[PDB]
Design a protein around this ligand. Structure first.
Ligand SMILES: [Mg+2]
Ligand SMILES: [Zn+2]
Ligand SMILES: [Zn+2]
Ligand SMILES: [Zn+2]
Ligand SMILES: [Zn+2]
Length: 601
């Protein structure tokens, strides 16, 4: 049990200064902040904690304001004394999710530097799939220690206290422990992170440097027009009502638009084969097949899609506008995906329909402020370019080299015809093959997505490998090492461990084999994207142009650029992204602009 004896609670300047002197001479030290809210931009700093040595940590309360709270060093006074140490790049800090802390300090005009180690990222790089990378999971896994939970000191539910309401000593136990455990986690993980130069490279030159740039992107936020979203919502209400009628009219009587309940009784009772369509989903979607002739499955399908879209983005997004900035601040997660790509929540920018018009209207609500424009920088089919590289296939490589449509170039080879004559259907077949190879799909899967008979798909795949031998060889070679070393790597050294690579369980070992093939391409795309963000942010920081990096979604970086600077800036972003990241993968950056994200997209 952590008691009040473990860690000191600093309530006087003299003591704070004595600690600052020790921190200044420490090789590294844990740093952590506590606030009155999870919302970074509007959160108020309530206290700070530090750990200079395992078991030696302190909590410095500055804004606890409960009834009769003891005198504390003022927030302004503690920060001005701590500022030098915090802004000193030579003073190395260790922390758990330093992105958050860096942000809090920015609310006070303090630029946290010396952001050297993030235990969350140390864990994530050691083994992205070992388990959760939050401090509590980490303490238990590496230290066989159970940390004091936030709920344990603040309570639960709507009546949960905010940190400023917690007693100084209780808060200190929690906060000082955070710092102490963080330092101990570091001391155990950092040595380990050195058994391999690949992961070490990714941690050092990619993950750690990205910490402050993610903070700036999140705190910058994005401008959303709540009027547009609202009109969209109202229109969606009217369209949903109409579709309900169109469905009723195509059939008889009223009824809900739910399968395996009301739909199967209409759809099939009036002809059609019995198996219902599960929302499994992207492998045998019964409703969408029928859609080619049967009108009911078509409107029901469109009904659900719009209803889901309305409640997820049209009705939620406007509620996410932060009253303090008038903008929306998405949460990027740097240590969640198995492959290394950044994830996003509230909102999940990546789940906004890409090839759909309604998705297009959602994006139209993402606007540029007055006298600025939204600029979108996209890495054209970066994963396919990466597979071309990893497979050393002169064919694909040449196709990209001469600027040809790889799907049409591929079709021209698989189907044997001039590139100019390749039809839309052949392009669509090659495209499915290409992107199927990335996710390591089966000839049968290709068929279930192409609506052709099995072995007809197998035919297309055998033709592809004959013409593109390098891709099969890459695949066979990748699955080989996956079983040999238990993991696959990206170009920069990032690893994906594959525990079920020998699962004995067919389904599991199947999955592990698909991940083996995919991770290297998806992970490398991610590494490239992260390196670009770092390079672009560095230019932004150094030159201070009139541009803000506001989003990262899929393989694109989105900015706000002043209308009078678009040309010079577009050129610069372009050169940074395709010429200041990896020089081996043939990269192409497509840059666009407009009044909103949809226009620039
Ligand atoms: Mg191909
Ligand atoms: Zn903490
Ligand atoms: Zn992609
Ligand atoms: Zn996109
Ligand atoms: Zn270029």
């Amino acid at each position: 049990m952590i008691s009040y004896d473990n860690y000191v609670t600093i309530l006087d300047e003299e003591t704070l200064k004595a600690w600052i002197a020790k921190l200044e001479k420490a090789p590294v030290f844990a740093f952590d902040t506590e606030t009155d809210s999870l919302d970074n931009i509007s959160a108020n700093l309530v206290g700070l904690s530090f750990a200079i040595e395992p078991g030696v940590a302190a909590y410095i309360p500055v804004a606890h304001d409960y009834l009769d709270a003891p005198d504390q060093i003022s927030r302004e006074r503690a920060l001005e004394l701590l500022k030098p140490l915090l802004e000193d790049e030579k003073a190395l800090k260790v922390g758990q999710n330093l992105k958050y802390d860096r942000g809090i300090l920015a609310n006070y005009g303090i630029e946290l530097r010396g952001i050297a180690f993030d235990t969350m990222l140390e864990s994530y790089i050691l083994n992205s799939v070992a388990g959760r990378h939050d401090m509590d999971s980490l303490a238990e896994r590496w230290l066989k220690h159970k940390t004091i939970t936030f709920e344990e000191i603040a309570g639960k539910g709507k009546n949960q206290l905010t940190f400023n309401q917690i007693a100084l000593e209780e808060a200190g136990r929690y906060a000082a422990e955070d710092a102490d455990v963080t330092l101990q986690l570091h001391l155990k993980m950092w040595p380990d992170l050195q058994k391999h130069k690949g992961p070490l490279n990714v941690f050092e030159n990619i993950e750690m440097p990205l910490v402050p740039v993610l903070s700036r992107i999140e705190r910058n936020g994005v401008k959303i027009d709540p009027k547009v979203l609202h009109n969209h919502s109202e229109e969606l209400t009217l369209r949903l009502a109409e579709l309900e009628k169109k469905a009723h009219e195509i059939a008889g009587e009223e009824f809900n638009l739910s399968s395996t309940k009301q739909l199967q009784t209409i759809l099939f009772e009036k002809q059609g084969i019995k198996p219902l369509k599960k929302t499994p989903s992207t492998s045998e979607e019964v409703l969408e097949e029928l859609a080619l002739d049967y009108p009911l499955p078509k409107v029901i399908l469109e009904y659900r899609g719009l209803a889901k879209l309305k409640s997820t983005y049209t009705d939620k997004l406007p509620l996410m506008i932060n009253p303090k900035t008038g903008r929306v601040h998405t949460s990027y997660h740097q240590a969640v995906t198995a492959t290394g790509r950044l994830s996003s929540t509230d909102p999940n920018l990546q789940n906004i329909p890409v090839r759909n018009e309604e998705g297009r209207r959602i994006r139209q609500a993402f606007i540029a402020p007055e006298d600025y424009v939204i600029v979108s920088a996209d890495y054209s089919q970066i994963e396919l370019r990466i597979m071309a590289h990893l497979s050393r296939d002169k064919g694909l490589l040449t196709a990209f080299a001469e600027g040809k449509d790889i799907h049409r170039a591929t079709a021209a080879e698989v189907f044997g015809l001039p590139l100019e004559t390749v039809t839309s259907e052949q392009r669509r077949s090659a495209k499915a093959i290409n992107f199927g190879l990335i996710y390591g799909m089966s000839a049968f899967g290709l068929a279930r997505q192409l609506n052709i008979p099995r072995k007809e798909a197998q035919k297309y795949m055998d033709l592809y490998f004959e013409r593109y031998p390098g891709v099969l060889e890459y695949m066979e070679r990748t699955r080989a090492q996956a079983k040999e070393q238990g993991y696959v790597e990206t170009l920069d050294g990032r690893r994906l461990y594959l525990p079920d690579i020998k699962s004995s369980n067919g389904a599991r070992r199947a999955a592990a084999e698909r991940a083996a093939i995919n991770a290297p391409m998806q992970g490398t795309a991610a590494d490239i994207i992260k390196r670009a963000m770092i390079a672009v942010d560095a230019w932004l920081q150094a030159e201070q142009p009139r541009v803000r990096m506001i989003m990262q979604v899929h393989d694109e970086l989105v900015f706000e650029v002043h209308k009078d600077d678009v040309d010079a800036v577009a050129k610069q972003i372009h050169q940074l992204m395709e010429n200041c990241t990896r020089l081996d993968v043939p990269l192409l950056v497509e840059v666009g602009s407009g009044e909103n994200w949809d226009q620039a997209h």
